[PDB]
Every structure is written in C-alpha cells, then in structure tokens.
Subunit: 73 residues, 7 copies
C-alpha cells in the first residue's frame, strides 16, 4: 500500500550500483547515501566512456539527470 | 469520469513492461512498484542497446525521464 | 470564451491518433484516456522508427515530452 | 502598458500560422484555439519534414515545446 | 541598485534584435513587445538557417527557449 | 557562513567574462548587470563560433541556459 | 539518519574537484564555495576539451546543469 522504491535504495546502501544519466553517461560506484530527489553519494566511483574506465573515487550525483539506478548483480 | 492511467499501471504490477526513456534508452523488466510521478521499480530488468541485451536485475527508474511504459503483449 | 483543446481530446477518445514526442519518437495508437497534463493511455499502439513498425499494444505516455497529438484523418 | 503577445494570438484565430518546436519540428495549420501556456489547436495542420509536406488535419500542440508561432503573411 | 536587464529590453522596443534559441535557432526582427518571462513579439522577423534567410513577419517567441537577445548595432 | 557566488559576480561588474551556454554556445562580454537567476546584461559582447568572433554589442542572456561564468584572466 | 551529500561538499572546500555538466562539458578546479542547489564557485578552474586544457581562473558554475561533482583523489 506504498511505493517501495525508497526501500530499494535503502537496501542498496553499501552495494555497487550502475547509474546512467542524461547525455549518455554511465557510472558505477558504491552507494553510500541518497535523498528523496535521488541525489546520490557514491564512493569508489568510476565513469565508463566508450570502453574506457576512469576511476573518480567520491562522487556526488544530481538526481535531476539520473535515468536509472541498478544494484550490480 | 476519471483518467485510467493509474489503473493501467496497477494492472501491470508483476507483468513485463517495455520502458523508453530520454536519450534513446530502451529497457524491459517486470514492474514491481511505481508512484504518481511514474518513478518505477523493475526486477529482472535489461537494457536493449544496439540490438544486444544487457541484464541488470533490480532497477529504480526516474519518471521524469520516462517517455512511455507499455506492458509487453 | 474558453480554449477548446480539451474538448478536442475528449472527442478523440476511441479514435486513432498520431503522437510525436521529444527525441524524434513517433507513435500511433487508439486514444483511450488522458488527463490535463496530456499524459495519455493508448491501445493497439505502435512505434514508427526509420520505416520500421513495432506493435506495442497498451501504452501509457507522459505528457511532458509530447510535442503534438493528431487524430488520424 | 501591457504585453501584446496575447492580443497577437487572438488576432491570428482563423489564420494559417507557422509553428516550430523543439527537436527541429516545423508545422503549419489554421489556428483555432490557444491558451496562456501557448498550447494550440490547429486545423488542416501539416508537418514539413525534409522539404516534404505531411498532412495531419486536427492537431493539439503543447506550448512547453514551442519555439515560436508566426502568422503566415499570405 | 537594481538589475538593468529589463530597462535594456524597454530601450530596445522598435529596434532590430538578434535572438538565438535552443536547438540552434537564430532569428532577427524588430522587437515590438515583451514580458518578464522574456516571451517576445517580433515584427518583420526572419529565420537564419545555414545561410538561408526565410522571412516570417510577425512572430511570438517563447522566452523559455531564449538563449540571448542582442539589439543589432 | 554564506555562499560567496553572488559576491563574485558583484566583483565582476566591469570585467570581461567568458560565458558558455547550453547547445555549445560561447560568449564573451563586459558584465554590466545581473540578477539572482544569473540572467546577464553584457556590453561589447561577442560570440565565438567555430574559432571565429562575431561582435554583437549589448546582450541580455537568460540564466536558465548558462553553464558557467568566468571573468577573463588578465 | 540524514543524507551526507552536503557534508561531502563541505569537506571538499579547498580541494581539487572534477565537475561534469550537461552537453559534455568537463571542468576541473578548486572548490571555494557552493549552495544547496549545487551552484559552485571554483578557482584555478580549467576546461578539458578534446584532451586539451583551457585555464579559466575563477568560475561560477550553475548547479542546474551539473551532472556530478567528484573530489579528485
Ligand atoms: O525515483 C525515485 C527513486 C527513489 N525514491 C525514494 O523513494 C521514496 C519514495 O517516497 C523517497 O524517500 C525517495 O528517496 C523516489 O521517491 N523516487
Ligand atoms: O503518466 C502517468 C501514469 C500514471 N498516472 C497515475 O496518476 C497519478 C498521478 O500522480 C498516479 O497515482 C498514477 O497512478 C499519471 O497521472 N500519469
Ligand atoms: O494540451 C492540452 C489539452 C487539454 N487541456 C485542458 O484539459 C481539459 C481536458 O478535457 C480541457 O478542458 C482543456 O482546457 C490543456 O490544458 N492542455
Ligand atoms: O509566449 C506567450 C504567448 C502568449 N501569451 C499570452 O499571454 C497570456 C498569459 O497568461 C495568455 O492569455 C496568452 O494569450 C503569453 O503570456 N506568452
Ligand atoms: O534577464 C532578464 C530578462 C528579462 N527580465 C524581465 O524582462 C523584462 C525586460 O524589460 C523586465 O520587466 C524583467 O522583469 C528579467 O528580470 N531578467
Ligand atoms: O548563481 C548564483 C549567483 C548569485 N546568487 C545570490 O543571489 C544574489 C544576487 O544579487 C547574491 O547576493 C548571491 O548570493 C545565487 O544564489 N546564485
Ligand atoms: O546535492 C546536494 C548537495 C548539498 N545539499 C545541501 O545543501 C546545503 C548547502 O550549503 C548543505 O548543507 C547540504 O546539506 C543538498 O541538498 N544536495
């Protein structure tokens, strides 16, 4: 009787997640924190660009451009 | 005497749906939860990219970037 | 002495309509329901992509990306 | 002492207008109705795509994605 | 002790201006009216597209897509 | 104990600034005025298009499409 | 029991940060200030365009077009 998206992100704290953003951006990282707007705090994050992988470390991601968030299987 | 879009989504719970997003993204998965902004929780989700299928598993999709959702026939 | 766009959509219930969206999407389907934000419920819908036609069936379309809706003559 | 954009649209009722939208869309038709958000109802509308004309008839256009509306001189 | 953007546009009434919009649109015309949202009423307007010049005459432009407005020297 | 972005802009009045906008636009001009929404008034402005400079003069820029503002060094 | 994104940014004051924006813009600089909307004040900022570095100095970045902010490791 309530949406479970929030419960899902809470369950993802500490897990690696795949995040895709507007303008064809693809990021992977450990989800450490997030808010109701889907703004995210990732650690050990990395960008995947045309097969290249660039480690970034800590990353704050604005929710407005997030397409989806998926815990890596 | 009321729009039936929400009713359609409720009826799609547990069914596979095709979801297209901004920037030509195409995703398929089992609809498990959603809210009034069309934010979605999908299970057994996959992206269709250039004819290939990438399995992702659990996926939270932001409604703001959703173009359409269609239960797979 | 009032805009007649809503009356036009009401009159299009049950008719086939052409809908184009942001990012060059073109869809055709039977309009079954809609709301004041132009969110739409289509049945027997199909996507037209580069000459290809993909049948989808039931489709919920977010009005925010809708460019136009035109009852098929 | 007030903007006249609204009066211009009122004056275009019944006239053909050229309308361009986001993502390079170009449409023409007779303006039959409009609101303050620039949502439009066109009759005898047609899309101009790569120099070719596609007749659509009645068309509801969302103002959110309109760039400009220009009554056709004629 | 106040922003002077509004004053500038007021001073441009009756002048020819260059207006550039989202998606690479470039327009020239005489500014006849405007509002606080930068919506514009132009007369004797023309579009400049890849070297082509198409005369349009009267044009109502939505401020939301305006990039800049520059009265022509 | 407060953001200093507005103070930076205030300090930029009279200086030439580089402004880049959505859709790859690059502009330069003297910052003369601005508001809390980052709408800008530029004088002696110019666009840089494909390496070439096009002088425009006075220009009103909408903050919504602004990516960044940077006073030109030296 | 609260999101830690804001605290991450506070901790990054005086640090080198990598910032990516809409339309494929990539910027590097020292974070000097910021607000709740992710508008940023950067110093010794530079743009990375096609693999080359363009030094810009002081830069105010609008949060609305920011994709992510990542403190350089
Ligand atoms: O698209 C999304 C993804 C996640 N959530 C989270 O799920 C809860 C829904 O009420 C919120 O706390 C929020 O953090 C949303 O609301 N929307
Ligand atoms: O595009 C859509 C899909 C669904 N709904 C339904 O309408 C309510 C909108 O807030 C929600 O509860 C949802 O079920 C919409 O309005 N728009
Ligand atoms: O694009 C549209 C279509 C319809 N409506 C309104 O929604 C109602 C639908 O019956 C009408 O009264 C009409 O004013 C809009 O505001 N915008
Ligand atoms: O871009 C435009 C075009 C027209 N109007 C007119 O101004 C009024 C604003 O509420 C409406 O009645 C409408 O006709 C605008 O405000 N903005
Ligand atoms: O950057 C801008 C552009 C326009 N305006 C509004 O547009 C009108 C321009 O003369 C003014 O009344 C003002 O309210 C602004 O506030 N900021
Ligand atoms: O991007 C910006 C620029 C300025 N300001 C604030 O808005 C006021 C404009 O005069 C200033 O005091 C400043 O703190 C912002 O919030 N964001
Ligand atoms: O993405 C972000 C980054 C920071 N903040 C908050 O906005 C304030 C800016 O000073 C901080 O206290 C911080 O908690 C957010 O809400 N979202």
């Amino acid at each position: 009787c309530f949406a479970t998206l929030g419960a899902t992100l809470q369950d993802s704290i500490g897990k690696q997640v795949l995040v895709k953003l507007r303008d064809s951006h693809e990021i992977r990282g450990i989800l450490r924190s997030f808010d109701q707007h889907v703004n995210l705090l990732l650690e050990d994050a990395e960008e995947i660009i045309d097969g290249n992988v660039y480690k970034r470390g800590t990353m704050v991601v604005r929710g407005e451009n997030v397409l989806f968030i998926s815990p890596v299987p």
